[PDB]
Structures are given as C-alpha cells and as structure tokens.
Scaffold this active site. Sequence first.
Site, PDB file in Angstrom:
ATOM      1  N   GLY A 171      -1.954 -11.697  -7.298  1.00 51.26           N
ATOM      2  CA  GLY A 171      -2.461 -12.132  -8.648  1.00 51.26           C
ATOM      3  C   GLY A 171      -3.660 -11.119  -8.820  1.00 51.26           C
ATOM      4  CB  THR A 181      -1.037  -8.183  -2.896  1.00 47.58           C
ATOM      5  OG1 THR A 181      -1.933  -9.327  -2.622  1.00 47.58           O
ATOM      6  CG2 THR A 181      -1.645  -6.948  -2.333  1.00 47.58           C
ATOM      7  CD  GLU A 212     -15.964 -11.093   5.849  1.00 47.34           C
ATOM      8  OE1 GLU A 212     -17.015 -10.427   5.928  1.00 47.34           O
ATOM      9  OE2 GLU A 212     -15.179 -11.658   6.616  1.00 47.34           O
ATOM     10  CE  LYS A 231      -4.081 -11.714  -4.064  1.00 43.15           C
ATOM     11  NZ  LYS A 231      -4.136 -10.288  -4.874  1.00 43.15           N
ATOM     12  CG  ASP A 268       1.890  -5.518   1.920  1.00 40.49           C
ATOM     13  OD1 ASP A 268       2.936  -4.584   2.121  1.00 40.49           O
ATOM     14  OD2 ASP A 268       1.433  -5.527   0.733  1.00 40.49           O
ATOM     15  CG  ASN A 303      -3.498  -5.007   1.599  1.00 41.43           C
ATOM     16  OD1 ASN A 303      -4.096  -5.421   0.646  1.00 41.43           O
ATOM     17  ND2 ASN A 303      -2.457  -5.086   1.749  1.00 41.43           N
ATOM     18  CB  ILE A 345     -11.994  -6.652  -7.322  1.00 45.24           C
ATOM     19  CG1 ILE A 345     -13.147  -7.168  -7.180  1.00 45.24           C
ATOM     20  CG2 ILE A 345     -11.308  -5.530  -6.490  1.00 45.24           C
ATOM     21  CD1 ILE A 345     -13.349  -7.982  -5.824  1.00 45.24           C
ATOM     22  CE  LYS A 389      -0.515  -3.371  -0.271  1.00 47.55           C
ATOM     23  NZ  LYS A 389       0.104  -3.477  -1.466  1.00 47.55           N
TER      24      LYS A 389
HETATM   25  N1  LIG Z   1     -12.330  -9.634  -0.083  1.00 41.78           N
HETATM   26  C1  LIG Z   1     -12.600  -8.496  -0.694  1.00 41.78           C
HETATM   27  O1  LIG Z   1     -13.807  -7.991  -0.928  1.00 41.78           O
HETATM   28  C2  LIG Z   1     -11.847  -7.827  -1.723  1.00 41.78           C
HETATM   29  C3  LIG Z   1     -10.647  -8.482  -1.835  1.00 41.78           C
HETATM   30  C4  LIG Z   1      -9.650  -8.371  -2.832  1.00 41.78           C
HETATM   31  N2  LIG Z   1      -8.674  -9.216  -3.078  1.00 41.78           N
HETATM   32  O2  LIG Z   1      -7.263  -8.654  -3.388  1.00 41.78           O
HETATM   33  O3  LIG Z   1      -8.496 -10.148  -2.802  1.00 41.78           O
HETATM   34  C5  LIG Z   1      -9.743  -6.932  -2.943  1.00 41.78           C
HETATM   35 CL1  LIG Z   1      -8.323  -6.254  -4.320  1.00 41.78          CL
HETATM   36  C6  LIG Z   1     -10.704  -6.186  -3.006  1.00 41.78           C
HETATM   37  C7  LIG Z   1     -11.602  -6.410  -2.022  1.00 41.78           C
HETATM   38  N3  LIG Z   1     -12.762  -5.874  -1.845  1.00 41.78           N
HETATM   39  C8  LIG Z   1     -12.842  -4.453  -1.991  1.00 41.78           C
HETATM   40  C9  LIG Z   1     -13.352  -3.734  -3.175  1.00 41.78           C
HETATM   41  C10 LIG Z   1     -14.335  -4.378  -3.955  1.00 41.78           C
HETATM   42  N4  LIG Z   1     -14.919  -4.006  -4.998  1.00 41.78           N
HETATM   43  C11 LIG Z   1     -14.331  -2.887  -5.613  1.00 41.78           C
HETATM   44  N5  LIG Z   1     -13.163  -2.282  -4.937  1.00 41.78           N
HETATM   45  C12 LIG Z   1     -12.872  -2.634  -3.791  1.00 41.78           C
END
Ligand SMILES: NC(=O)c1cc([N+](=O)[O-])c(Cl)cc1NCc1cncnc1
Length: 294
Positions: A16, A14, A77, A33, A123, A128, A10, A125
């Site tokens: 890792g 932040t 999730e 992550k 943090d 997030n 993905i 933004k």
């Molecule tokens: N909880 C999540 O689903 C999630 C967690 C993290 N993370 O850092 O643990 C990140 Cl970067 C993006 C996420 N989803 C958005 C997304 C999904 N696929 C493609 N682009 C954006």
Amino acid sequence: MENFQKVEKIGEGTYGVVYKARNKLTGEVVALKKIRTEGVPSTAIREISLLKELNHPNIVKLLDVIHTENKLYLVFEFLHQDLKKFMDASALTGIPLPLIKSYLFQLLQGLAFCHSHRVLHRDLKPQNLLINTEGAIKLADFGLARAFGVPVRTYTHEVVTLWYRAPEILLGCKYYSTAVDIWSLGCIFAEMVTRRALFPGDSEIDQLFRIFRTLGTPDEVVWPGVTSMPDYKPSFPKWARQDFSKVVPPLDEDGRSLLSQMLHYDPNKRISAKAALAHPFFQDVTKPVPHLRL
Ligand SMILES: NC(=O)c1cc([N+](=O)[O-])c(Cl)cc1NCc1cncnc1
C-alpha cells in the site's frame, strides 16, 4: 487520523501507500503503511500482531498494527534510506568491501533470528533493506508475505520485481522454506559487489532462464526432484554452468565460496543463515560507517 501527523509520502509501498509520520503524542517519527483489500482477514491481523514480538537489531521494528474501517495500518520504526538508493548512489565508486561484508553479516544475523523463530521474509530485495548513519542495516517487511499468502503486486499497477526470486518459487513450488531468503540475499550480495543485478529478468520465464544461463540448467544430479516440480518443462533449454570467477569479479575466493553456497539450486543444499555466519568470509568482518547523504 488519530495521533498521527503526516510529514510526507515515502512511496507506493509493496502492500500500500507509505508515509513518514509523526506521532503527535510520543513525538516519534515513524513509517506508516496503509494496507488495502475491502475485507482484510482476521487471520492476517492475528499473524501480523505476532510479528510485533519479533524484535532484533537487524529487523525493522513493527511498532503497531491498527485495524480500522477497511484499511490496515502498520506502524514501523523509521530509517532514512534503503539499500537500493544507497547502491545507486555508490554506483560510480562501489560500496567498499568492508561495508558490503558488514551489511551481509548483519542481514544474515537478522535472517538467522527470523528463521529460528519460524518467520520467513519471502520477498527480500534491496528496497526492503533499510540503513542508518551508524552502519546498521535492517530487514523490512518480514512475515507480511505469509500473513497474506501471496503478495502479487503493490496496489497501483506496479511491475513486481522477480530479480531476487529463488528458482523453486519460479518452478511453482507451493511450500517456501527458509532457503528462499538465503537465495535472495545471495543475489543482493552479488549486486553490491558487481554494481549490477545478478539476474535481472523481466518475466517469470526470462528470470528462470537468466538463472539457468549462469548457473546451468538444473537436473536431477544437482537438484533431486527438480524435474517433478509443478512448472518444470522437459523442453527447457540446457545451458552449461558458468564459472563464478566470471559472475562476480573481482570478489575473492572466500566471497565466491560463500556466494556459491547461497545460490545452490537444491533448497536443501543451500547454506543456512546460521552456517553462513561461520563462513571464513567473515573472519575479518568489522562495522564501518557509511557515507550517507540525507
Ligand atoms: N521503515 C521505514 O522507514 C520505511 C518503511 C517503508 N515502508 O514501505 O513501510 C518504506 Cl517504503 C521506506 C522506509 N524507509 C526508507 C526511506 C525513508 N524515507 C525516504 N526514502 C526511503
């Protein structure tokens, strides 16, 4: 390894690397992550574990914390898109006011819940804030910053975004309060409305001065104690405050009023999430369906 099948990376998260993965067992799709560095404090594992209990509809669920051979895995999730990408995609037309309002209202409900449970985000933004097809928006990474004191960077020489940092942090305050999240959310609210970052600083001092150029250089009148802050310098230039009507046009007075309260310099004067939910701006809030392309 062990129960997870990686679907794809993905991004350079932040703390890792992040992968979309499928739990071979449950069959569920999740965000995994992988955290740094070569030690991983046992204090963090306990604090993080505490966050598994922090469940609310506007907070990304932390499904599991897995500590193993130099590496901490956080299982969340999964949501398909973040607000940063959504705003870029809505750049030409802008996010409809009703949806901006719904998102702000939901994020404040999430913050109110976190803050009532003594959890700070620290943090916030656009990247997030995750969204789905049902019109929901959720806070991601709540509490990680504290379970690590100061995040600093990612893991692969990335430029830390200071755009949403509250002035008390920039001025070296060592104790963050719930107010820092309200400030960040105010900056995000402005950005959804204008389609441009409110304070896009490219250094800590440029961030601070961009804030000062718009809201006026703070003084003891509007922010008691500001001149005694760790990084405050009497040599800071003194800029006059600009009018909100010029900062977030064409937002209405209800919106400008709420934004002004979320951006007060004094953390103690800054509106709480609970109080913001009662602001007249939300009199007509609804929950629209976003036009999401996945
Ligand atoms: N909880 C999540 O689903 C999630 C967690 C993290 N993370 O850092 O643990 C990140 Cl970067 C993006 C996420 N989803 C958005 C997304 C999904 N696929 C493609 N682009 C954006």
